Amino acid sequence: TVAAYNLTWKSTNFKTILEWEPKPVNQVYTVQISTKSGDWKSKCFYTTDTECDLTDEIVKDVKQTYLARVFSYPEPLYENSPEFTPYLETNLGQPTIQSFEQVGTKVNVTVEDERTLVRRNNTFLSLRDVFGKDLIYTLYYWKSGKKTAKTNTNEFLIDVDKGENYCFSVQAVIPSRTVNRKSTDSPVECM
Amino acid sequence: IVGGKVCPKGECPWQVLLLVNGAQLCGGTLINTIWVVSAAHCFDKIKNWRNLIAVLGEHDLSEHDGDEQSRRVAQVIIPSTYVPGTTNHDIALLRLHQPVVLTDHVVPLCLPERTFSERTLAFVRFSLVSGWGQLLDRGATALELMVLNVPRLMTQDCLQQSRKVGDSPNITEYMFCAGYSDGSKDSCKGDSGGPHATHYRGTWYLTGIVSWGQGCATVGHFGVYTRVSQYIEWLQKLMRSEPRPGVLLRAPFP
Amino acid sequence: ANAFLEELRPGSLERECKEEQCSFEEAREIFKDAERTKLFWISYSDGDQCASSPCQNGGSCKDQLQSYICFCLPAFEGRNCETHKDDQLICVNENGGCEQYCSDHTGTKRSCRCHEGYSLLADGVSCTPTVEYPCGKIPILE
Numbered sequence: 001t002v003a004a005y006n007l008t009w010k011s012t013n014f015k016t017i018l019e020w021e022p023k024p025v026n027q028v029y030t031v032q033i034s035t036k037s038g039d040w041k042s043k044c045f046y047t048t049d050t051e052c053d054l055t056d057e058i059v060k061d062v063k064q065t066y067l068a069r070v071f072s073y074p075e076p077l078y079e080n081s082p083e084f085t086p087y088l089e090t091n092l093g094q095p096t097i098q099s100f101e102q103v104g105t106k107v108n109v110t111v112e113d114e115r116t117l118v119r120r121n122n123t124f125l126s127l128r129d130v131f132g133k134d135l136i137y138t139l140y141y142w143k144s145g146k147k148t149a150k151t152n153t154n155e156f157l158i159d160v161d162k163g164e165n166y167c168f169s170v171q172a173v174i175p176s177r178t179v180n181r182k183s184t185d186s187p188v189e190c191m
Numbered sequence: 192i193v194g195g196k197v198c199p200k201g202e203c204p205w206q207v208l209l210l211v212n213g214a215q216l217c218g219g220t221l222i223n224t225i226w227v228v229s230a231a232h233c234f235d236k237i238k239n240w241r242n243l244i245a246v247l248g249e250h251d252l253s254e255h256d257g258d259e260q261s262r263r264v265a266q267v268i269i270p271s272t273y274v275p276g277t278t279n280h281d282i283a284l285l286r287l288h289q290p291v292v293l294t295d296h297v298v299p300l301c302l303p304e305r306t307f308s309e310r311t312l313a314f315v316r317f318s319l320v321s322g323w324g325q326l327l328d329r330g331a332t333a334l335e336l337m338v339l340n341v342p343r344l345m346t347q348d349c350l351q352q353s354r355k356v357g358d359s360p361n362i363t364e365y366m367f368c369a370g371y372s373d374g375s376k377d378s379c380k381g382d383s384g385g386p387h388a389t390h391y392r393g394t395w396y397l398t399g400i401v402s403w404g405q406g407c408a409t410v411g412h413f414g415v416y417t418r419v420s421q422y423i424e425w426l427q428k429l430m431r432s433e434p435r436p437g438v439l440l441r442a443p444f445p
Numbered sequence: 446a447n448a449f450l451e452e453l454r455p456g457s458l459e460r461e462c463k464e465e466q467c468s469f470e471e472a473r474e475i476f477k478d479a480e481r482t483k484l485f486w487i488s489y490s491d492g493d494q495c496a497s498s499p500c501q502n503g504g505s506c507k508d509q510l511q512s513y514i515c516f517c518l519p520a521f522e523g524r525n526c527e528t529h530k531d532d533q534l535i536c537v538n539e540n541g542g543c544e545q546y547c548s549d550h551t552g553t554k555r556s557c558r559c560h561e562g563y564s565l566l567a568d569g570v571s572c573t574p575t576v577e578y579p580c581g582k583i584p585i586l587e
């Protein structure tokens with residue numbers, strides 16, 4: 001047998017899946033995940049896939065730092081994954097502009113408060129519920145010349161010239177972060 | 192025990208104190224009224240085999256009370272594969288001349304089944320190690336029974352996380368590391384033979400034996416314990432056997 | 446899309462990219478600027494990866510750039526919610542829910558057992574002491 005390698009975390013909005021190599025040839029795998037002081041919990045028992053969904057475990061506490069390892073079968077050979085702290089590393093999904101209403105000389109651009117995989121009371125918490133104040137949205141618009149705005153909520157209130165039509169695009173951002181601080185730009189919307 | 196705390200009297204009921212000629216020798220673990228599991232190396236320099244005593248219900252070596260029960264050790268069984276002066280197969284099964292009385296202060300630790308221990312107990316992060324050993328490397332032994340919670344490591348991690356040294360003992364499949372590499376906590380020489388007990392769903396089980404390590408709580412090193420799961424069958428078969436004429440007995444392993 | 450002579454008319458996002466499928470060039474004629482056209486095109490032409498209905502067992506698909514995300518129902522997990530959480534009753538998985546010993550059995554459910562001095566309760570998973578001083582229990586704390 002050969003130990004797995006290139007263990008990588010694929011996480012967006014807390015949907016976290018561990019991936020690895022190589023493509024199993026006469027060998028199966030079993031994944032174990034834990035917190036530094038917690039017990040090891042097994043997942044994807046004897047799977048032949050080269051991936052393992054660990055979402056249900058990490059959403060139990062997104063602020064904890066998890067370590068996972070992949071056991072190889074024809075103590076067993078294994079490889080550790082990098083440490084993973086959900087709250088600080090899960091990628092922010094592509095946002096969606098929910099709407100925008102013009103009121104005189106101003107426009108209110110609202111950003112959809114998308115849900116995450118974090119469960120709570122039989123429901124999925126929104127990106128706002130999870131990050132609270134650590135999350136802000138940035139607006140990149142233009143008169144149809146670049147313009148930008150920032151909000152700590154899910155809405156932007158900006159000035160617009162009467163008659164002219166504008167186009168908008170937003171990004172979810174967690175300023176305090178060091179890695180994956182921003183999501184990709186949302187689709188472009190035009191009034 | 193380095194960096195631990197006193198085990199409140201009665202909270203380490205399976206802990207055994209082994210003496211030779213009345214002198215402190217090693218620790219041990221009671222697993223039933225007549226049998227005690229300790230470390231093989233504890234007997235490397237024993238001359239008077241008829242003077243080995245096992246004390247149960249001990250706590251404070253400077254005060255005597257009614258929870259103490261002494262028993263002559265009628266037999267010391269060591270694997271034929273163990274070599275004095277070394278570290279592999281560091282385990283000994285001791286038969287007490289007379290069974291001890293089970294009380295609130297004298298209770299045996301459970302010897303688990305092999306697969307349960309390998310598949311479940313081995314992945315419980317923390318376990319307790321205890322004894323009246325040195326409080327510091329090269330220091331004095333303890334008067335009151337000490338206990339410490341240490342995390343277990345798979346051998347591959349132990350090796351990768353330990354300072355690569357010269358030709359030191361190898362970590363075999365009959366051992367496992369546990370503890371810390373920052374020089375703060377670990378068991379020590381005088382704790383040898385004592386239990387490495389694992390708590391799982393309301394019950395404690397014997398998973399290891401204080402065996403060896405480079406110094407005690409040495410930066411870049413972990414304590415090493417005999418991997419008891421490898422000896423479950425060996426132990427069970429011996430406990431069902433008849434005693435031999437002499438005290439020392441070497442039984443084949445496997 | 447382009448119909449006979451429609452290109453005589455000024456560019457319209459609504460008539461061209463919303464009510465119809467517009468090519469990159471058509472999009473470029475509306476937005477003009479290069480970066481603006483690309484910012485729009487990346488999402489417009491990405492295609493909805495949720496179209497295949499990849500999320501199994503009643504899960505909900507959430508579209509993303511060149512990917513998707515499956516939100517599963519409580520009793521399911523996996524990239525596509527393909528894993529049945531109620532079908533993992535095996536010994537390696539949290540000791541099969543057994544309080545003490547666990548034995549697997551192909552074809553049927555795993556069974557639980559206990560160490561000497563304990564008996565398996567009616568629930569088939571728990572173990573209760575059958576003696577006064579069972580192993581592994583600390584009297585003064587019980």
Ligand SMILES: CCS(=O)(=O)N[C@H](Cc1ccc(-c2ccccc2)cc1)C(=O)N[C@@H](CCC(N)=O)C(=O)NCc1ccc(C(=N)N)cc1
Nearest residue numbers: 232276277357358359378379380402403404405406407414
């Ligand atoms: C360094 C001498 S030592 O500190 O006594 N370590 C030796 C092994 C050992 C380790 C390392 C080397 C070594 C060799 C080359 C280069 C550097 C070091 C050599 C021997 C060692 O541990 N030897 C055994 C006895 C061997 C016998 N049958 O007589 C021993 O002392 N056991 C008691 C013990 C219990 C717990 C710990 C602990 N948790 N911490 C440490 C020790």
Ligand SMILES: *[C@@H]1O[C@H](CO)[C@@H](O)[C@H](O)[C@H]1O
Nearest residue numbers: 494495496497498499512
């Ligand atoms: C639906 O389309 C996506 C595109 O990525 C594919 O990954 C799924 O397997 C399919 O069901």
Ligand SMILES: *[C@@H]1O[C@@H](C)[C@@H](O)[C@@H](O)[C@@H]1O
Nearest residue numbers: 503504505506516517518
């Ligand atoms: C999407 O989310 C999943 C979990 C289910 O609740 C579906 O009914 C819903 O559409």
Ligand SMILES: [Ca+2]
Nearest residue numbers: 251252254255
């Ligand atoms: Ca005493």
Ligand SMILES: [Ca+2]
Nearest residue numbers: 446447448451
């Ligand atoms: Ca057209």
Ligand SMILES: [Ca+2]
Nearest residue numbers: 446447461471
């Ligand atoms: Ca057109």
Ligand SMILES: [Ca+2]
Nearest residue numbers: 452456471474
């Ligand atoms: Ca056109």
Ligand SMILES: [Ca+2]
Nearest residue numbers: 459460463464
């Ligand atoms: Ca229309």
Ligand SMILES: [Ca+2]
Nearest residue numbers: 460461464465
């Ligand atoms: Ca048309």
Ligand SMILES: [Ca+2]
Nearest residue numbers: 470471473474
């Ligand atoms: Ca053109």
Ligand SMILES: [Ca+2]
Nearest residue numbers: 452470471474
């Ligand atoms: Ca054209």
Ligand SMILES: [Ca+2]
Nearest residue numbers: 491492493509
């Ligand atoms: Ca898409």
